[PDB]
PDB file of C-alpha atoms and ligand atoms in Angstrom:
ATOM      1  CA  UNK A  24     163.920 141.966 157.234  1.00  0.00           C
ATOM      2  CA  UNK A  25     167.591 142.283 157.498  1.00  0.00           C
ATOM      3  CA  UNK A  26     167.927 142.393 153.692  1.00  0.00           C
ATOM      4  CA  UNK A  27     165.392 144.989 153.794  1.00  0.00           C
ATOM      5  CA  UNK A  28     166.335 147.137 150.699  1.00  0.00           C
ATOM      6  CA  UNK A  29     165.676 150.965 150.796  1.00  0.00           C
ATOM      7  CA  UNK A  30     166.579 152.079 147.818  1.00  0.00           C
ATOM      8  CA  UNK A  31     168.152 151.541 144.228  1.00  0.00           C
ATOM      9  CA  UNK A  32     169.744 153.681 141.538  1.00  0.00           C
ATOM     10  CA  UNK A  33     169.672 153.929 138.684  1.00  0.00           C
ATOM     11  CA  UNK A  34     166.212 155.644 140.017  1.00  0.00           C
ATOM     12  CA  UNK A  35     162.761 155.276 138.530  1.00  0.00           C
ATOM     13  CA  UNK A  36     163.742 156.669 134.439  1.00  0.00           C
ATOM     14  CA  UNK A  37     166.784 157.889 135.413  1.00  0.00           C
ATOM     15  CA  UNK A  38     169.242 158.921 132.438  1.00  0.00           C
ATOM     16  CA  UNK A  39     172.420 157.342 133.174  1.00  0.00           C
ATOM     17  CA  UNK A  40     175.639 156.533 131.032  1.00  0.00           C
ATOM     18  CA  UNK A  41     176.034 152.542 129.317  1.00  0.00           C
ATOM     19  CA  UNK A  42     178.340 151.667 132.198  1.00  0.00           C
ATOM     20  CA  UNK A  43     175.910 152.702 134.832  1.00  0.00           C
ATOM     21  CA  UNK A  44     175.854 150.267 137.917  1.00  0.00           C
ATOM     22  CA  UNK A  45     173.198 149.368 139.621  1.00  0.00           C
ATOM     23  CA  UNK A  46     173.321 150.028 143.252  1.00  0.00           C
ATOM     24  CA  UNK A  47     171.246 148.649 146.011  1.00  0.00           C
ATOM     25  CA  UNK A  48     171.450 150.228 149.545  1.00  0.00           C
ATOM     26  CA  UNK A  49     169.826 148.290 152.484  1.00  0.00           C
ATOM     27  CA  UNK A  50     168.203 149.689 155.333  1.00  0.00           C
ATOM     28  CA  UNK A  51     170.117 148.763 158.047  1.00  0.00           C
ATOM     29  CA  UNK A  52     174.485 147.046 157.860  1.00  0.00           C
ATOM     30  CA  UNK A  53     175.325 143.498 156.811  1.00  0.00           C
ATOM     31  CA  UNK A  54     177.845 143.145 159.035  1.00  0.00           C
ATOM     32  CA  UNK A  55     178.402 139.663 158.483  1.00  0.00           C
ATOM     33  CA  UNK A  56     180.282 138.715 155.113  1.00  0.00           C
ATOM     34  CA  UNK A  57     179.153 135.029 155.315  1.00  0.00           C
ATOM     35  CA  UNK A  58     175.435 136.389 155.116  1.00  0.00           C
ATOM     36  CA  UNK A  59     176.697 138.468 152.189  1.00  0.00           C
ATOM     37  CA  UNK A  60     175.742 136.340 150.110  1.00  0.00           C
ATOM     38  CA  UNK A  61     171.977 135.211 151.271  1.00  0.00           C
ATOM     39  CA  UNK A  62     171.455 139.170 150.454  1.00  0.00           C
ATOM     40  CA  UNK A  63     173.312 139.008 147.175  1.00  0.00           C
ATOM     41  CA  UNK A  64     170.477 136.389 146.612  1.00  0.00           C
ATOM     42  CA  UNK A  65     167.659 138.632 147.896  1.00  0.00           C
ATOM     43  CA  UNK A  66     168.547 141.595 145.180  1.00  0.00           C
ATOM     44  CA  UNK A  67     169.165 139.246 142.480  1.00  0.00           C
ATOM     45  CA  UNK A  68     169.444 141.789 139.400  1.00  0.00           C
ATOM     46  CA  UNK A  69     167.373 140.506 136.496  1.00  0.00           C
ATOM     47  CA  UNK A  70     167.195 143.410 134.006  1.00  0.00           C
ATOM     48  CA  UNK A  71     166.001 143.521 129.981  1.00  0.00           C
ATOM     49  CA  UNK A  72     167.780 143.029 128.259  1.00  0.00           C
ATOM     50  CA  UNK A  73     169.278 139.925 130.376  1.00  0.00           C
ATOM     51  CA  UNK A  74     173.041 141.196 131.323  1.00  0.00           C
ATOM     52  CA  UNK A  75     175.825 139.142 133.691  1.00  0.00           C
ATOM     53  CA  UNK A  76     177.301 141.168 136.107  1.00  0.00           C
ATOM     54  CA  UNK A  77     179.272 140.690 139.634  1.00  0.00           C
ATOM     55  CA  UNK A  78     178.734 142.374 142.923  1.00  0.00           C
ATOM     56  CA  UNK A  79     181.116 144.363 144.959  1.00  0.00           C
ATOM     57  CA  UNK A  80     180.211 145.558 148.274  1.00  0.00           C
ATOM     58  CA  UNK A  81     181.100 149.107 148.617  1.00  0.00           C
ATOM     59  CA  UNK A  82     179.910 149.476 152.749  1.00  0.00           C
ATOM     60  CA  UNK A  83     178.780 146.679 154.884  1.00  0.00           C
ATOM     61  CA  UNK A  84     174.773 148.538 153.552  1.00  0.00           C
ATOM     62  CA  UNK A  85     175.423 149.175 150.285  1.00  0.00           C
ATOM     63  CA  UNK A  86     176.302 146.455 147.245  1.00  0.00           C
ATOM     64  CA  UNK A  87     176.638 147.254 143.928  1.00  0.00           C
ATOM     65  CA  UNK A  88     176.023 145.014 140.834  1.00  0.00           C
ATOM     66  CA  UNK A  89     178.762 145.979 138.209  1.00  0.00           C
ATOM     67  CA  UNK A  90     177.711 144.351 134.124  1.00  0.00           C
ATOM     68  CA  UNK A  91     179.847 142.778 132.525  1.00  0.00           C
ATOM     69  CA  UNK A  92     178.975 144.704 128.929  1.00  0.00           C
ATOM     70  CA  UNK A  93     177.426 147.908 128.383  1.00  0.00           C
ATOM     71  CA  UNK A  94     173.967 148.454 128.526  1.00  0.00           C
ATOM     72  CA  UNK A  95     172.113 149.360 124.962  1.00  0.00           C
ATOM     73  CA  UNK A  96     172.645 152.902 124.430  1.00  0.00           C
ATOM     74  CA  UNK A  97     169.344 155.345 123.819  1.00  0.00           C
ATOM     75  CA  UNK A  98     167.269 152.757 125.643  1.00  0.00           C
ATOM     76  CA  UNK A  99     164.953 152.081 128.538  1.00  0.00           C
ATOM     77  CA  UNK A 100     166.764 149.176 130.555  1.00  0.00           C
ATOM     78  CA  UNK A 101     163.874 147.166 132.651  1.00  0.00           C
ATOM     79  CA  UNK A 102     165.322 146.742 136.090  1.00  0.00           C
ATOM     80  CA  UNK A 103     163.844 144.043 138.555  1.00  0.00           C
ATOM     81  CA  UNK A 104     166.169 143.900 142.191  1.00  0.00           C
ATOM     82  CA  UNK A 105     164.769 141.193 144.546  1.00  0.00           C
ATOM     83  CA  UNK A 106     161.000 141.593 143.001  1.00  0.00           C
ATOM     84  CA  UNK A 107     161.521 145.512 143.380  1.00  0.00           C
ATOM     85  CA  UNK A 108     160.435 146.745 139.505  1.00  0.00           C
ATOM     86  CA  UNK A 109     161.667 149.666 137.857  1.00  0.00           C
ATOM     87  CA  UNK A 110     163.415 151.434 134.957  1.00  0.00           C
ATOM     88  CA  UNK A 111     165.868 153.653 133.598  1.00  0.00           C
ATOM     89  CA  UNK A 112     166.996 155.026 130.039  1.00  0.00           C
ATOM     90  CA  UNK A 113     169.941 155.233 128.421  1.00  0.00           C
ATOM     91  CA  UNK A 114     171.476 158.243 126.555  1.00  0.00           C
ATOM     92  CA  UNK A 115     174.830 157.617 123.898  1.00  0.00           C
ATOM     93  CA  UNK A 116     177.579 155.249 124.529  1.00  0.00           C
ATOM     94  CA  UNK A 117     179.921 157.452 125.098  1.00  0.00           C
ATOM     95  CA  UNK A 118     183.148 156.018 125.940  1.00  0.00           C
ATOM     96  CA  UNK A 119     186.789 157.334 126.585  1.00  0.00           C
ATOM     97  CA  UNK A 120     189.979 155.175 126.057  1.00  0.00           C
ATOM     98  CA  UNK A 121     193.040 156.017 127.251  1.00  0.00           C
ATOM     99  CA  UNK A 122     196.531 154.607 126.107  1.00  0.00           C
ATOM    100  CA  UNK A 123     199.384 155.062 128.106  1.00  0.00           C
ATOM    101  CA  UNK A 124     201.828 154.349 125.756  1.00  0.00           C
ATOM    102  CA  UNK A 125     200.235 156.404 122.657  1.00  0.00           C
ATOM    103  CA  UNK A 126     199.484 159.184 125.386  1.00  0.00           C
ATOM    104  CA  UNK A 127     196.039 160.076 124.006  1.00  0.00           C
ATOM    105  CA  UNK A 128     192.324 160.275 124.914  1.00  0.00           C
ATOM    106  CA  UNK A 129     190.150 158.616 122.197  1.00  0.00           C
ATOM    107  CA  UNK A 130     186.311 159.561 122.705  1.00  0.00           C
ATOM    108  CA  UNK A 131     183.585 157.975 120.542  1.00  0.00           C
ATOM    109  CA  UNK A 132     180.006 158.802 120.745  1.00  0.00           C
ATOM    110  CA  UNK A 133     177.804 155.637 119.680  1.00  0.00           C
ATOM    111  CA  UNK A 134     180.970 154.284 118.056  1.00  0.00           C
ATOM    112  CA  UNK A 135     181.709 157.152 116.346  1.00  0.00           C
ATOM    113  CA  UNK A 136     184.854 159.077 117.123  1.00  0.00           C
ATOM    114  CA  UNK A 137     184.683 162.642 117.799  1.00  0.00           C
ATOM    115  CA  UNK A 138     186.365 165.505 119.142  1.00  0.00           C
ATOM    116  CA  UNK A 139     186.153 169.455 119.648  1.00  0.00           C
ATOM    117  CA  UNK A 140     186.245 171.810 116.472  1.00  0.00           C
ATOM    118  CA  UNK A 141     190.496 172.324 116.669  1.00  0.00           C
ATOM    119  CA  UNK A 142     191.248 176.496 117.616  1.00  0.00           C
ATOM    120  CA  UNK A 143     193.042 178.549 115.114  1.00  0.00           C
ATOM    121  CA  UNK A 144     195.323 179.702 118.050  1.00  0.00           C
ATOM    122  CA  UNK A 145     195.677 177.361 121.204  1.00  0.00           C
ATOM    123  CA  UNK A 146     199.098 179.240 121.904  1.00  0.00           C
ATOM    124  CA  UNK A 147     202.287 179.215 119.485  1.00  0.00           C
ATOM    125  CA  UNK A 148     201.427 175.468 118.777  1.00  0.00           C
ATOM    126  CA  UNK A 149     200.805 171.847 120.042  1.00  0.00           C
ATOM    127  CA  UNK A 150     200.590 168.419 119.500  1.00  0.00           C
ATOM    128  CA  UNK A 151     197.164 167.631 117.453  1.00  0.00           C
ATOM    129  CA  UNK A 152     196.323 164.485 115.923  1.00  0.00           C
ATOM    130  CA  UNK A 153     194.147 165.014 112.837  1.00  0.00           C
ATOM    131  CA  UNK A 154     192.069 162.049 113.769  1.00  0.00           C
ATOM    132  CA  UNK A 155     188.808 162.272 115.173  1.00  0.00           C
ATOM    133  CA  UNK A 156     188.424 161.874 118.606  1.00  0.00           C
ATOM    134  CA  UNK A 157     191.866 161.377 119.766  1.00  0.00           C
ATOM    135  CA  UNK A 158     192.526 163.677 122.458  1.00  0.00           C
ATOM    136  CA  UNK A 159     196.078 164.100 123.252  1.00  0.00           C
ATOM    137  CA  UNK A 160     196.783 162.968 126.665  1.00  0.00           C
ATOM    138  CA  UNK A 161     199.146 162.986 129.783  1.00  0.00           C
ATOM    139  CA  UNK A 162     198.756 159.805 132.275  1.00  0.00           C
ATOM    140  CA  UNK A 163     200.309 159.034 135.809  1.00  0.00           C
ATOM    141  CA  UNK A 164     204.810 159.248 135.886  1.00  0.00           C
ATOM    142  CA  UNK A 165     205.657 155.419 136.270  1.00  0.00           C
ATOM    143  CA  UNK A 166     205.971 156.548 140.388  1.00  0.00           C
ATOM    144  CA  UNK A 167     202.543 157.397 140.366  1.00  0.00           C
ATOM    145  CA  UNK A 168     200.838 155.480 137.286  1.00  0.00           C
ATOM    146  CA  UNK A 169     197.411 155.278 135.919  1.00  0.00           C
ATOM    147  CA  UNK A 170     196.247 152.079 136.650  1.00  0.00           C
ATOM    148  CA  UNK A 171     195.174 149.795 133.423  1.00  0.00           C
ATOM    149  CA  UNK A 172     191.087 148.533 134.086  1.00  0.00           C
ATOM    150  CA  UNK A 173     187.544 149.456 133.168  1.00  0.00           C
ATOM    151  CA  UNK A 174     186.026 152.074 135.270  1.00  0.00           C
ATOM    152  CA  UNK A 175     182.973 154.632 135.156  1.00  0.00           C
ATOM    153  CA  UNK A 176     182.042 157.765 135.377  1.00  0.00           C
ATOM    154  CA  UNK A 177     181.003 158.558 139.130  1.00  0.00           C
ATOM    155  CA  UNK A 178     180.283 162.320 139.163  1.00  0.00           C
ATOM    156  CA  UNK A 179     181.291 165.646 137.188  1.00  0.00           C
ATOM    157  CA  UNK A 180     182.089 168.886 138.952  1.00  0.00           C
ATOM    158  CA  UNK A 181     183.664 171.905 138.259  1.00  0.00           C
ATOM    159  CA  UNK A 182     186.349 173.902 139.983  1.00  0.00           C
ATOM    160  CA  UNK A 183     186.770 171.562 142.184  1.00  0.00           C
ATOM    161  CA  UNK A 184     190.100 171.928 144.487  1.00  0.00           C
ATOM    162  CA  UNK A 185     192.751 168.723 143.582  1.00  0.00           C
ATOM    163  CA  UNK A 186     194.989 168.052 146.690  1.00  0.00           C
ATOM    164  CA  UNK A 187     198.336 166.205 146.569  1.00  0.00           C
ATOM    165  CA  UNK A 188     197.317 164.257 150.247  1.00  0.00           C
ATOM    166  CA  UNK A 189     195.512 162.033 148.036  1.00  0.00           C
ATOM    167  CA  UNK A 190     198.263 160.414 146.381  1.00  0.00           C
ATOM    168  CA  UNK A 191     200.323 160.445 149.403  1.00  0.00           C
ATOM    169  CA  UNK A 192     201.964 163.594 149.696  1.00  0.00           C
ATOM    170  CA  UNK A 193     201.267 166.354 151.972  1.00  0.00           C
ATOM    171  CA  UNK A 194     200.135 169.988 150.743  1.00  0.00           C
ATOM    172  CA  UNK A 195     203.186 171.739 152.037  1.00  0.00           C
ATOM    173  CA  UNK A 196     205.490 168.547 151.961  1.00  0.00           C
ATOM    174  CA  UNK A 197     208.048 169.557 148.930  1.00  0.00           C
ATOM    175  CA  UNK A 198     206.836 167.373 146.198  1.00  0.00           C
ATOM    176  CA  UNK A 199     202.763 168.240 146.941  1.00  0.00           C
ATOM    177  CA  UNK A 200     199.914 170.631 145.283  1.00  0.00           C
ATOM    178  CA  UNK A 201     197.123 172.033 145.522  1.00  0.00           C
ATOM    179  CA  UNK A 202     195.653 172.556 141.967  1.00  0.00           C
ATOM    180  CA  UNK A 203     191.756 174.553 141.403  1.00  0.00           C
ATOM    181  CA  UNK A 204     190.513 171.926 138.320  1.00  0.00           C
ATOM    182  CA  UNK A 205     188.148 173.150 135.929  1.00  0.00           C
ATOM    183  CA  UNK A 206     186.626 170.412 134.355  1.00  0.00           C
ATOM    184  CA  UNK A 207     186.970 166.924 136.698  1.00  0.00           C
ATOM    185  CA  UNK A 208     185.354 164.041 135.598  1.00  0.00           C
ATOM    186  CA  UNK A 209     185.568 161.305 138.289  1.00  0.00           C
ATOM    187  CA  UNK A 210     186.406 157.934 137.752  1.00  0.00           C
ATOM    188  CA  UNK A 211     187.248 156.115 140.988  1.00  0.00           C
ATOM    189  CA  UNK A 212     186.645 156.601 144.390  1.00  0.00           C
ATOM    190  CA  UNK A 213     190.114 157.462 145.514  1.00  0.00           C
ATOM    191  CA  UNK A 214     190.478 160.611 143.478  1.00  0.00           C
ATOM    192  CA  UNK A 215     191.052 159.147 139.875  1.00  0.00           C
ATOM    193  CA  UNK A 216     190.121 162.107 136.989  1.00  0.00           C
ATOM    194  CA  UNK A 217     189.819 162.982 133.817  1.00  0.00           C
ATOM    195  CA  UNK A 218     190.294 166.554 133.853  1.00  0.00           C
ATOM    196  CA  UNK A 219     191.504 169.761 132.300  1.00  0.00           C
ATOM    197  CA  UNK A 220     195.588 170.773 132.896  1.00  0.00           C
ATOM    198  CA  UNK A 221     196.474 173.768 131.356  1.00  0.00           C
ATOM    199  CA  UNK A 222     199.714 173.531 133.281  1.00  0.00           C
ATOM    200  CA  UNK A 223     200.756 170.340 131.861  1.00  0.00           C
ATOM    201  CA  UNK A 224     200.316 171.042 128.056  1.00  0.00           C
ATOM    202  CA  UNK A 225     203.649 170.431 126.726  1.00  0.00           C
ATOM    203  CA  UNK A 226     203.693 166.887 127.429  1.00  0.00           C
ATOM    204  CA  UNK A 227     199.960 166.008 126.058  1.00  0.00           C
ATOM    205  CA  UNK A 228     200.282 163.600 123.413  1.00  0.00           C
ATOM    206  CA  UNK A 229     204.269 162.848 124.188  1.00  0.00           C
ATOM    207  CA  UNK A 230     205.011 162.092 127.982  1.00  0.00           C
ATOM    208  CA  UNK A 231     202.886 160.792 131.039  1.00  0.00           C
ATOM    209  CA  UNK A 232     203.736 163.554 133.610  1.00  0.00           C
ATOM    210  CA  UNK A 233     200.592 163.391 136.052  1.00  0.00           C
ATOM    211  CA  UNK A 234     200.133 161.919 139.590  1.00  0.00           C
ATOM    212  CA  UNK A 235     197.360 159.152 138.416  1.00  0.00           C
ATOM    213  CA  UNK A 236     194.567 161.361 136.481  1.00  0.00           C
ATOM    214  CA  UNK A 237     194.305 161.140 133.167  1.00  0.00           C
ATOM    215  CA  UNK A 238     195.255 165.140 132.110  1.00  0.00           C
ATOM    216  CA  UNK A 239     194.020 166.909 128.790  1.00  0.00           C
ATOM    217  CA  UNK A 240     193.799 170.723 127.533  1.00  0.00           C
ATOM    218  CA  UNK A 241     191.053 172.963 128.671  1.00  0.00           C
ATOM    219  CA  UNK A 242     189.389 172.307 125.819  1.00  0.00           C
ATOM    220  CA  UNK A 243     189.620 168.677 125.165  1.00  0.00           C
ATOM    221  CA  UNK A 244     188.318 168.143 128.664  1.00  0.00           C
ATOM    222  CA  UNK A 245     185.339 170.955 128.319  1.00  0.00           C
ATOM    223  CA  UNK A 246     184.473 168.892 125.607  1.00  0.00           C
ATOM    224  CA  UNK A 247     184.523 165.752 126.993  1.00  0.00           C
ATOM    225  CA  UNK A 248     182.944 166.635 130.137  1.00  0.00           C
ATOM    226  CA  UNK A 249     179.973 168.099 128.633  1.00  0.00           C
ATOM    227  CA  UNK A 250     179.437 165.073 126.262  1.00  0.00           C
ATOM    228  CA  UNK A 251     179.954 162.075 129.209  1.00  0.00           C
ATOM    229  CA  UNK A 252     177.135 161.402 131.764  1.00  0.00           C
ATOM    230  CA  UNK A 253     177.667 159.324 135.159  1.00  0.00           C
ATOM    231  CA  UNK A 254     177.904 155.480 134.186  1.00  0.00           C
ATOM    232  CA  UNK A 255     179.889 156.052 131.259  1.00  0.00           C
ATOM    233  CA  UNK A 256     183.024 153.769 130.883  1.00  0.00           C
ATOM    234  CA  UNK A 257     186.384 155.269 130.981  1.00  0.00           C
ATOM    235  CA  UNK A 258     188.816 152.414 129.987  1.00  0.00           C
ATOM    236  CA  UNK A 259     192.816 152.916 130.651  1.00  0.00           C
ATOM    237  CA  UNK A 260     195.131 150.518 128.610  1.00  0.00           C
ATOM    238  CA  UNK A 261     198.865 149.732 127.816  1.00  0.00           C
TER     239      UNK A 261
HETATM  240 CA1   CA B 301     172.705 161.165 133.994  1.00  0.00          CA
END
């Protein structure tokens, strides 16, 4: 019973985001890579509709089965993991591009880009698009860059305190922060965001001034935030 699995998520009709992983933890460590893949085997993900996907192990108990495509949206996925049955649902595909050469945010909901209703006074004035959906954007300096790949959604918070240590830089060492983010949608483990930056609004849309996260207005990101659920995709490009 070594491959022993005790749980899964998504969980049992779970709503999750068209990225979602799915993410089998085992009982007790696999300490041994080379029997990695005998319990790869074991939790063989069969789900309907049929999907490809690869596994990464993210701790020597946990391994999680990444697809290669995006579930249906507004669905019920069927889930079988080593004869284990279950379920989950689906709400909107809602996905988030960002370029780091245009220096925008494009959000569409089941294909469909869309934004916030625009505010009759943001401040004096600011870079708007007139496009729906395009969110205008500030992305990593080239010293510390948002890097290009697919990722998802792994949790949403609010007010949550942003620390420069994670990037490298200590709190009180000159170049280092300590921020309070409002909105902070999280996108990798080591402390990649989307998030709200008030601070940083006169280069959305024109220049990439952030540490890594991908940095919109208050009210782009409230937006955003409130539309995305964990398992979305958040993809970064050229
Ligand atoms: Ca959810």
């Amino acid at each position: 019973y070594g491959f022993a699995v005790a749980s899964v998520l998504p969980t049992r009709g779970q709503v999750v985001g068209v990225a979602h992983p799915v993410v089998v933890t085992f009982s007790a460590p696999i300490t041994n890579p080379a029997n990695r893949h005998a319990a790869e085997r074991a939790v063989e993900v069969k789900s309907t509709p049929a999907m490809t996907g690869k596994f990464e192990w993210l701790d020597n108990d946990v391994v999680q089965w990444v697809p290669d495509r995006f579930w249906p949206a507004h669905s019920t996925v069927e889930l079988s993991v080593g004869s284990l049955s279950s379920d989950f649902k689906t709400g909107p595909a809602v996905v988030g591009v960002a370029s780091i050469s245009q220096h925008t945010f494009t959000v569409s909901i089941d294909g469909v880009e869309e934004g916030p209703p625009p505010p009759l006074p943001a401040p004096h004035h600011r870079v708007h698009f007139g496009e729906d959906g395009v969110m205008p954007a500030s992305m990593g300096r080239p010293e510390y860059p948002t890097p290009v790949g697919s990722y998802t959604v792994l949790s949403k918070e609010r007010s949550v305190i942003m620390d420069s240590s994670s990037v490298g830089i200590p709190v009180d060492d000159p170049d280092g922060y300590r921020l309070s983010v409002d909105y902070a949608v999280r996108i990798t483990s080591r402390g990649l965001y989307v998030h709200s930056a008030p601070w940083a609004l006169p280069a959305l849309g024109l220049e990439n001034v952030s540490h890594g996260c991908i940095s919109l207005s208050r009210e782009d990101a409230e937006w955003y935030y409130n539309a995305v659920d964990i398992g979305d995709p958040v993809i970064v490009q050229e």
